Amino acid sequence: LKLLDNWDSVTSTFSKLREQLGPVTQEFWDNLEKETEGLRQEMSKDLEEVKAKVQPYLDDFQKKWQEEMELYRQKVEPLRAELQEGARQKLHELQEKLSPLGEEMRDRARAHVDALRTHLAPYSDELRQRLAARLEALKENGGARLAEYHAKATEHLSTLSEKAKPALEDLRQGLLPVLESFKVSFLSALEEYTKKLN
Amino acid sequence: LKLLDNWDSVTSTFSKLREQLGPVTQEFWDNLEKETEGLRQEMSKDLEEVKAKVQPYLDDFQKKWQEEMELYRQKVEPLRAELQEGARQKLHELQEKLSPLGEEMRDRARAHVDALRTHLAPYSDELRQRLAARLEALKENGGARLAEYHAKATEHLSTLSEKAKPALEDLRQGLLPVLESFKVSFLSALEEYTKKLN
Ligand SMILES: CCCCCCCC/C=C\CCCCCCCC(=O)OC[C@H](COP(=O)(O)OCC[N+](C)(C)C)OC(=O)CCCCCCC/C=C\CCCCCCCC
Ligand SMILES: CCCCCCCC/C=C\CCCCCCCC(=O)OC[C@H](COP(=O)(O)OCC[N+](C)(C)C)OC(=O)CCCCCCC/C=C\CCCCCCCC
């Protein structure tokens, strides 16, 4: 009955909470009305003054910004001209540079890769010999290693069968009485669990 | 007793593990010897080929690096000049911007900031005038609420104590038989558990 007795004190408090919620909501809204009323009076001033003054605000800034934009455009043109004239020369110089230097770079690139070709041909061939020597050795060595590992695997499995059979047998044989002792204690423990659970 | 047999079986598996590793390690050493011997014939050629490859490689790469160094010198040198000229031109281009537009922007800033003075100053005072009433509302309604909260505080304390008195007495009156029966449950549980856990 702990739930009922305690819940009774909870239901009564909740009821008393409503008894306090009533007046509190009335007083809260009562004062909130005064707040909204004052805030409305202030807001009327806020909006009116902000709006009436927003005109000269935006007008002043817009008129100035208008000139600013005009001056900006009046500058953008000659400034872009300087940039254009400059770009024409700068790009021309770069063009007149990328042409000879491009040819030179391409020519040097030719020798760069071509001289590399003269080395790549033998280099790759030598690598083939080295790789073949390694692969051939690793193949014979591999065959031996495979046999070695296979033999070790056989001995590993043979000695493992001597564990998978006798050792596991002993483990399984021990599991029987072990499970018995466990079941006996578990079954008896279940009694306590249920007994203490009511 | 079980742990004794368990460890006993582990002992047998250990001997048939260590002795298994006997020939295994001996053969593995020979196996490793094979790899080592192979590498003794592989790496010898590998290193010799590497030496006879890295030498002409670095040599030819030196030519390439020289080609590139010359290339970069023949590029960076004139490009540094062209870039300096172009940058100096751009600097002058910017100079004819940062100064004219700078003084212009400064005047724009004056027009903005000064306007802000005659726009934010009165606005701040307006805000104060509106905030004054706002604060007044918070003082009047605030003080009222403070009183309402005070009244409700007493009503809260009275209701809390109205519960605290019977609730604490009832809780203590409930905890007595509850803890008493719980103790009986604990005592029996302790005994029952010590009978199984042994
Ligand atoms: C049928 C069965 C029914 C039973 C139901 C019970 C219902 C509840 C009713 C009654 C419970 C009675 C328990 C009263 C406990 C009193 C603990 C207390 O008097 O303690 C004192 C400590 C003081 O300081 P100290 O002694 O440690 O320091 C020593 C430091 N030297 C000295 C320097 C200062 O107070 C501290 O430490 C304060 C630490 C504050 C930690 C707050 C943790 C907040 C986070 C999570 C809350 C989790 C809620 C669970 C959510 C559900 C998850 C599933
Ligand atoms: C003396 C004691 C000291 C402690 C102080 C007082 C704390 C309040 C105390 C006790 C709470 C009363 C007990 C709760 C009553 C249960 C009401 C209920 O049954 O409720 C359910 C709803 C719906 O939820 P549902 O769809 O999952 O369940 C639907 C369920 N099914 C799954 C069937 C569909 O749950 C809802 O309404 C819950 C929504 C979340 C409610 C948040 C309330 C936050 C309160 C104040 C912050 C407000 C500040 C205001 C300023 C605003 C500025 C913008």
Ligand SMILES: CCCCCCCC/C=C\CCCCCCCC(=O)OC[C@H](COP(=O)(O)OCC[N+](C)(C)C)OC(=O)CCCCCCC/C=C\CCCCCCCC
């Ligand atoms: C505890 C510590 C907290 C720390 C917080 C720091 C304070 C930061 C201050 C303010 C944060 C602003 C956010 C609060 C506003 C949430 C109002 C609310 O509850 O939003 C949700 C409700 C629920 O409907 P819904 O969104 O799901 O549906 C609409 C569905 N449709 C659009 C999608 C299709 O939306 C509705 O009821 C619809 C809209 C109702 C409009 C309410 C706003 C009225 C305006 C002014 C009242 C206050 C003026 C006071 C100014 C000075 C304050 C100092």
Ligand SMILES: CCCCCCCC/C=C\CCCCCCCC(=O)OC[C@H](COP(=O)(O)OCC[N+](C)(C)C)OC(=O)CCCCCCC/C=C\CCCCCCCC
């Ligand atoms: C201890 C230290 C030792 C020092 C040793 C020295 C290193 C040996 C020196 C030089 C050897 C260079 C060998 C590789 C150079 C050739 C790169 C090349 O031209 O390859 C051709 C591929 C062909 O692609 P596709 O046109 O048919 O396909 C496009 C078709 N669609 C779009 C359908 C996907 O092009 C591509 O993959 C490129 C396009 C996609 C990019 C993929 C990722 C590229 C990044 C890195 C690769 C760098 C390898 C360099 C290291 C060499 C190790 C020997």
Ligand SMILES: CCCCCCCC/C=C\CCCCCCCC(=O)OC[C@H](COP(=O)(O)OCC[N+](C)(C)C)OC(=O)CCCCCCC/C=C\CCCCCCCC
């Ligand atoms: C001999 C001694 C043996 C030991 C026995 C006792 C161990 C009890 C331990 C853990 C389990 C929690 C027990 C809660 C009982 C069920 C409440 C319930 O029926 O629950 C419904 C919700 C709904 O979800 P669903 O239908 O999708 O899942 C259901 C999933 N279907 C059906 C596949 C299964 O299931 C959920 O919540 C499921 C999530 C897990 C339950 C979490 C809630 C646990 C209760 C209280 C924690 C208090 C938190 C306090 C508030 C903190 C605020 C900060």
Ligand SMILES: CCCCCCCC/C=C\CCCCCCCC(=O)OC[C@H](COP(=O)(O)OCC[N+](C)(C)C)OC(=O)CCCCCCC/C=C\CCCCCCCC
């Ligand atoms: C193509 C046209 C040519 C362009 C010309 C540039 C050519 C490249 C040359 C120089 C650039 C410098 C690179 C910056 C890297 C390190 C910055 C640094 O060391 O940082 C930490 C310092 C610590 O403070 P401290 O008191 O110890 O150092 C003050 C004492 N001192 C200045 C003697 C060191 O912080 C400082 O120096 C504070 C940094 C504030 C810097 C304000 C510069 C304002 C001028 C112009 C604005 C330009 C806008 C245009 C952008 C578009 C370009 C396309």
Ligand SMILES: CCCCCCCC/C=C\CCCCCCCC(=O)OC[C@H](COP(=O)(O)OCC[N+](C)(C)C)OC(=O)CCCCCCC/C=C\CCCCCCCC
């Ligand atoms: C001197 C006088 C005093 C004034 C002081 C300032 C006080 C602030 C109070 C009131 C003024 C704000 C009220 C008006 C705001 C509404 C602006 C508006 O017209 O709203 C609507 C837009 C619409 O959506 P749309 O234009 O994208 O779509 C267009 C359509 N389309 C998708 C289709 C293509 O929605 C938007 O503008 C979305 C805006 C919400 C996003 C806010 C994100 C802010 C970012 C960072 C804040 C950092 C927080 C981290 C903490 C550090 C703090 C330092």
Ligand SMILES: CCCCCCCC/C=C\CCCCCCCC(=O)OC[C@H](COP(=O)(O)OCC[N+](C)(C)C)OC(=O)CCCCCCC/C=C\CCCCCCCC
């Ligand atoms: C129903 C009317 C009862 C009124 C109060 C009585 C009991 C309090 C009950 C509920 C309040 C729960 C909210 C959290 C309470 C924290 C308790 C705590 O553990 O507090 C100490 C910790 C220590 O941290 P600290 O030393 O760094 O901070 C303090 C330093 N500080 C001033 C310099 C910055 O502070 C913190 O956790 C930070 C917050 C501490 C807030 C202190 C404000 C105290 C205000 C007034 C004193 C009592 C007026 C009583 C009215 C008469 C009613 C009849």
Ligand SMILES: CCCCCCCC/C=C\CCCCCCCC(=O)OC[C@H](COP(=O)(O)OCC[N+](C)(C)C)OC(=O)CCCCCCC/C=C\CCCCCCCC
């Ligand atoms: C169902 C869903 C709803 C459930 C909600 C849960 C309701 C519980 C809510 C709030 C109460 C939290 C309690 C914290 C206040 C302590 C009251 C108290 O036991 O204080 C006596 C102590 C004595 O000193 P000491 O060193 O031994 O203790 C410090 C202990 N140590 C050292 C271990 C840290 O003094 C202090 O802690 C220093 C006094 C600090 C004064 C703080 C006053 C703050 C004022 C207003 C904040 C508003 C709270 C509103 C919530 C209540 C509405 C009715």
Ligand SMILES: CCCCCCCC/C=C\CCCCCCCC(=O)OC[C@H](COP(=O)(O)OC[C@H](N)C(=O)O)OC(=O)CCCCCCC/C=C\CCCCCCCC
């Ligand atoms: C995602 C990232 C992309 C890369 C971005 C790079 C941006 C860099 C930003 C600004 C320019 C920086 C300009 C830096 C100029 C200074 C270069 C120089 O000598 O620096 C000195 C450092 C010295 O390091 P130390 O560790 O020795 O000393 C530090 C010391 N321990 C301490 O605690 O203080 O050496 C080093 O940094 C390491 C070796 C450098 C060798 C140079 C190698 C340069 C080689 C060639 C030139 C560059 C190629 C240009 C290609 C165009 C032409 C073809």
Ligand SMILES: CCCCCCCC/C=C\CCCCCCCC(=O)OC[C@H](COP(=O)(O)OC[C@H](N)C(=O)O)OC(=O)CCCCCCC/C=C\CCCCCCCC
């Ligand atoms: C889900 C859990 C619900 C219960 C929860 C309880 C607490 C929950 C709260 C927090 C979690 C706990 C978090 C604990 C964190 C660490 C606690 C701690 O300090 O542990 C260390 C100690 C010390 O061990 P050491 O003993 O080996 O010796 C000293 C130690 N090195 C030192 O430097 O001090 O260990 C000991 O106390 C050993 C003594 C054991 C006593 C024998 C006890 C004998 C117990 C049982 C025997 C019966 C079984 C019979 C089986 C049948 C026969 C085979």
